[PDB]
Amino acid sequence: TQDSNYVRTLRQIELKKLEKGAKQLMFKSSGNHTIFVDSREKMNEFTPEKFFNTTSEMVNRSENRLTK
């Protein structure tokens, strides 16, 4: 029972290190973004920088896009 106590407190150390290490990281989002539009031409077009505003740097990663 005391070496089970030893392994259990080692496990709890790593558990707390895990949770308050993952609390201070940032993970890349992966969500199905959906945009609702009007009749058919707004859907046929490219969504023309409606929130990208550059098609090179600030389009395809969404953790912070920008408006210059």
Binding site: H33, T34, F36, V37, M43, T47
Partner: protein, 60 residues
């Protein structure tokens, strides 16, 4: 034209195409949403009639 008429029909009728990471859905019309109740869920309607036409009751 015989082998792709349903293809061009569905590809012109259907909406919500992809744009890279995104997907551009159409919103529907108050016309249809206020003239009709929504369609049946074919899953549950098929479940009920497939049950009433299961093989264990010998229909004929």
């Amino acid at each position: 034209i015989k082998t792709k008429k349903r293809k061009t029909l569905k590809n012109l009728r259907k909406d919500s195409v992809k744009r890279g990471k995104f997907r551009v859905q159409l919103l529907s019309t108050t016309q249809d949403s206020k003239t009709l109740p929504p369609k049946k869920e074919s899953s549950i309607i098929r479940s009920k009639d497939r049950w009433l036409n299961r093989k264990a009751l010998n229909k004929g």
